[PDB]
Write a protein that binds this ligand. Structure first.
Ligand SMILES: [Ca+2]
Ligand SMILES: [Ca+2]
Length: 269
């Protein structure tokens, strides 16, 4: 039996699926700890930029979980992604410990821009800026990639990098009441929010697990972007980003929530 995690329903992905929108034909890179082979995922390719971890399989769990929020397959098992037919790519930029470098992340962004990705999900961040990272965000953006990044989990009223950069779409986390999760960073540069508390997804060992974080919110938006791109193949990264924001549900101030809660039904109507 398949279940629909609450956040998938909260962002109204099933209504998009009912209109024939699944993310088919849209390439989404998950820049994370890898993605493990799993019967509820279809991994089309990828690359590793972590020295000593040449495989794109996930030694941590985080990247597999993020990937399933984007694209867990629509079938009779497991869970269901926002964009269950997205073309999913495992871009390992963080190792099994959950960390990498600005250089490995930049290499994954350049890979995305050189390999035809439409969306790159970066459920990762640091409090400090990086010239290396910014250059790669801008390069990927010039190549048509919509870079979607997590605001961070410190609870502060400023957001992490690379989410802070203008050419990243920064995503914070909400709870089941449509309040900002206490940990979700906010402030200047925040674009949108999505569910990030008690989010069940695919996990290594061919299982399913729940996590909290802005890392869990981010893939809801990356998946919604893929639905919008399937509906509107001619659109640019900027057009998709703007439409997701313009169709989000206001939840409060722009400083706490950006444009508000992503709404895949309104974005694909
Ligand atoms: Ca499934
Ligand atoms: Ca931003």
């Amino acid at each position: 039996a398949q279940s629909v995690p609450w956040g998938i329903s909260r962002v109204q992905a099933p209504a998009a699926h009912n209109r024939g929108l699944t993310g088919s034909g849209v390439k989404v890179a998950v820049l994370d700890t890898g993605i493990s082979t799993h019967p509820d995922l279809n991994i089309r390719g990828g690359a590793s930029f972590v020295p000593g971890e040449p495989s794109t399989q996930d030694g941590n769990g985080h990247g597999t979980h993020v990937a399933g929020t984007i694209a867990a397959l629509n079938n009779s098992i497991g869970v269901l992604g926002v964009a269950p037919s997205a073309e999913l790519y495992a871009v390992k930029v963080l190792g099994a410990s959950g960390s990498g470098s600005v250089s490995s992340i930049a290499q994954g962004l350049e890979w995305a821009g050189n390999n035809g990705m439409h969306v790159a999900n970066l459920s990762l961040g640091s409090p400090s800026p990086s010239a290396t990272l910014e250059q790669a965000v801008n390069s990927a953006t010039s190549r048509g990639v919509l870079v979607v990044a997590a605001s961070g989990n410190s609870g502060a009223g400023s957001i992490s990098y690379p989410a802070r950069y203008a050419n990243a779409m920064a995503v914070g986390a909400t709870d089941q009441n449509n309040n900002r999760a206490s940990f979700s960073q906010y402030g200047a540069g925040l674009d949108i929010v999505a569910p990030g508390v008690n989010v069940q997804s695919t996990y290594p060992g061919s299982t399913y697990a729940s996590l909290n974080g802005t890392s869990m919110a981010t893939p809801h938006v990356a998946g919604a972007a893929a639905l919008v791109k399937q509906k509107n193949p001619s659109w640019s990264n900027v057009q998709i980003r703007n439409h997701l924001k313009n169709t989000a549900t206001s939840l409060g101030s722009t400083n706490l929530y950006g444009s508000g809660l992503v709404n895949a039904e309104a974005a694909t109507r």
